[PDB]
């Protein structure tokens with residue numbers, strides 16, 4: 001198989017799993033039927049990441065940055081806006097062609113482009129090449145395997161290494177070699193005195209939660225934790241589990257647990273003991 005996370009998110013949203021008025025402006029809705037455990041897995045993934053982000057936002061009082069590496073058609077910028085939880089600046093990185101596609105959608109959809117300009121210092125946006133830079137939001141076409149390019153393009157969109165900064169790689173690191181991803185993680189740690197990293201990945205051949213923790217600790221992070229997605233699903237608020245479990249009928253074969261045990265959410269911090277960053281959990 002090979003899956004597009006943003007199509008699957010659009011699908012789960014359509015059934016009611018979580019609130020996202022924005023994703024429909026990026027991608028079409030499939031009319032297939034899906035095994036509902038897939039939707040539950042997506043809900044757990046998005047809820048886990050989101051609880052971690054909001055924890056970070058709370059500790060930093062939003063005086064911070066978020067850099068989402070390999071963001072795709074993520075809608076989180078627009079969701080945080082609506083919740084009044086925006087960071088000082090929000091950055092996205094993806095391949096240039098993935099970025100062009102995202103920019104074309106923002107250009108064609110005032111429900112996407114109005115909020116960006118509202119928070120912008122001008123009434124117009126320059127969408128030259130494969131970058132959109134504005135006051136609170138930037139989408140940057142770059143290759144995550146070229147760390148010096150990555151850093152140059154970020155800094156020229158006003159990424160400030162003095163601000164606490166949260167970086168997210170949500171199903172991205174698998175697309176690069178272990179050396180390349182280790183180098184990304186290391187760069188991320190080296191560039192900020194105060195920082196958090198969130199990594200959501202499949203637990204492949206040979207990997208384990210402990211190797212996931214060590215992958216971060218050995219690349220310059222000072223704290224790390226990791227849970228498999230079934231532990232996380234099991235720890236979801238009972239009101240949310242109740243809400244999402246009555247959306248679709250699930251048969252009696254306990255295949256949710258088969259699916260989720262192969263995914264993990266890991267997060268690490270560096271500095272900001274003053275901020276209580278090492279205390280953040282999902």
Ligand SMILES: C[S@@+](CC[C@H](N)C(=O)[O-])C[C@H]1O[C@@H](n2cnc3c(N)ncnc32)[C@H](O)[C@@H]1O
Pocket residue numbers: 005006069070071072073074093094095098142143144145169170171172175176
């Ligand atoms: C599996 S998708 C996940 C998208 C998004 N984070 C989500 O979870 O909905 C991975 C994304 O990583 C991007 N990606 C993979 N390797 C990359 C690279 N070397 N440089 C820039 N982006 C990359 C892909 O283009 C794709 O948009």
Ligand code: NA
Pocket residue numbers: 095096097098
């Ligand atoms: Na490209």
